[PDB]
Write a protein that binds this ligand. Structure first.
Ligand SMILES: [Eu+2]
Ligand SMILES: [Eu+2]
Ligand SMILES: [Eu+2]
Ligand SMILES: [Eu+2]
Length: 280
């Protein structure tokens, strides 16, 4: 009767067969998850099946788990991702939904197994499907205190920006306007505020500068005057006009106590003149 060599090596199996007056038969190789590579998987005849003196016994050997190359599915829609996995015999796939900022809602943000040889049985792939970015509600603070606005929205993860403007009907430090507001938007979004610095209720200079024209083809040049003073942060131009000849230009500046104001005059993008002026 056929001896049991299952889980054994070929080396040992032939030893057991010879001892039993039998020959090692043909050797073939099969993928297996149950048996470590180069262990007997199966015999013909099977263990305990009747045999006669000198008959051979064929053996099948483990080539270890059958494997594939893990595909890259990050950024594909869920169903494309799963199909691409099935197409390789990878069917043990669990989905986990998470918020994410790289892949849109319904698209795979992450793979368990990096884009590697994997066994096609009990592979335990996990795919992380994006729910999009977490939506957080932006509290509408129009006509309320900016300080409270900034702080409340900071604590919900928002980035807060503000410029200031004069107002006759909105208390100092109260919000003229807010964008966005009254709405849920992506976590961490920037909320923009226009804030009241009270009513337009400082010294005064008119500075003169001669701007030369340096253009070609009898074509005008564009002059841009940028001012930093009481109510101007030199952000955008306080003056914008074309020049076709030398022009004397006057630049009104209003300066607080203990401060300096300044002007820059550019001509076709290039600085031509600049000056600092103190509250004198
Ligand atoms: Eu028997
Ligand atoms: Eu191998
Ligand atoms: Eu499994
Ligand atoms: Eu000419």
């Amino acid at each position: 009767e056929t001896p049991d060599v299952i889980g054994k090596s070929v080396k040992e199996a032939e030893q057991i067969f010879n001892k039993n007056n039998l020959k090692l038969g043909k050797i073939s190789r099969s993928y297996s998850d149950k048996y470590p590579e180069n262990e007997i998987i199966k015999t013909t005849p099977n263990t305990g099946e009747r045999v006669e003196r000198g008959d051979s016994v064929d053996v099948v050997i483990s080539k270890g788990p059958e494997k594939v190359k893990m595909p890259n599915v990050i950024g594909l829609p869920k169903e494309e991702a799963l199909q691409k996995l099935k197409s390789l015999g990878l069917k043990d796939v669990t989905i986990e939904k998470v918020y994410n900022n790289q892949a849109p809602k319904g698209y795979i943000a992450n793979q368990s197994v990096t884009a590697t040889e994997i066994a096609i049985h009990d592979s335990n792939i996990k795919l992380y499907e994006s729910l999009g970015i977490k939506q957080v509600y932006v509290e509408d603070f129009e006509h309320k205190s900016f300080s409270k606005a900034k702080k409340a929205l900071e604590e919900k993860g928002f980035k807060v920006e503000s410029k200031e403007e004069y107002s006759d009907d909105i208390d100092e430090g109260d919000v003229i306007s807010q964008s966005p507001k009254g709405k849920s938007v992506d976590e961490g979004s920037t909320i923009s505020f226009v804030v009241s610095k009270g009513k337009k209720s400082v010294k005064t200079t008119t500075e003169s500068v001669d701007v030369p024209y340096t253009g070609k083809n009898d074509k005008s040049q564009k002059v841009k005057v940028y001012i930093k003073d009481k109510d101007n942060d030199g952000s955008t131009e306080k003056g914008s006009f074309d020049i076709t000849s030398d022009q004397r230009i006057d630049i009104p500046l209003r300066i607080e106590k203990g401060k300096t104001a300044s002007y820059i005059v550019k001509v076709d993008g290039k600085t031509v003149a600049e000056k600092e002026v103190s509250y004198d």
